[PDB]
Amino acid sequence: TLEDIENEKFTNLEILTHLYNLKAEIVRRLAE
């Protein structure tokens, strides 16, 4: 659902409606 993150029209701050926790998911997947 990578393209579903921006499928809906959110406000310019909410456009990271799922990237918020990806900001740490990337870190944890880099750890292992």
Binding site: T11, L13, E14, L16, L19, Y20, K23
Partner: protein, 122 residues
């Protein structure tokens, strides 16, 4: 009334919030350009600036523990701090205290690097 332009300003001053209105009485259009409940008050701006003095750019847990910016969003803190220095990346200023930014003028005047949107590109 007869002169509505002053009437609306007075009603905003005496009934509306300080976020919705302004000191003179004009609409805060920046408030209405964003979703309700997600607004960056200048109080949040000065709170973040004081937090830079407290700990500076780095991890954002203790900056949201004292909650200088009340009930703030962590990624919003790590994003709005970029506009303080004018650089799209903060790897050069991690875990350090800054008194005066000193970076806006030098990074804004860099003709060699990108000057778009009052910033400096990677």
């Amino acid at each position: 009334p007869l002169d509505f332009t002053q009437y609306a300003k007075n009603m905003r001053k005496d009934l509306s919030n300080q976020d919705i209105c302004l000191e003179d009485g004009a609409l805060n259009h920046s408030y209405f350009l964003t979703k309700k409940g997600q607004y960056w008050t200048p109080l949040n701006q000065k709170a973040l600036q004081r937090g830079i003095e407290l700990f500076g750019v780095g991890n954002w847990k203790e900056i949201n523990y004292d909650e200088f910016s009340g009930k703030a969003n962590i990624v919003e803190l790590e994003l709005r701090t970029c506009m303080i220095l004018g650089i799209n990346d903060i790897t050069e200023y991690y875990g350090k205290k800054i008194s005066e930014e000193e970076q806006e003028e030098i990074k804004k005047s860099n003709i060699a690097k990108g000057k778009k949107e009052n910033k400096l590109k990677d």
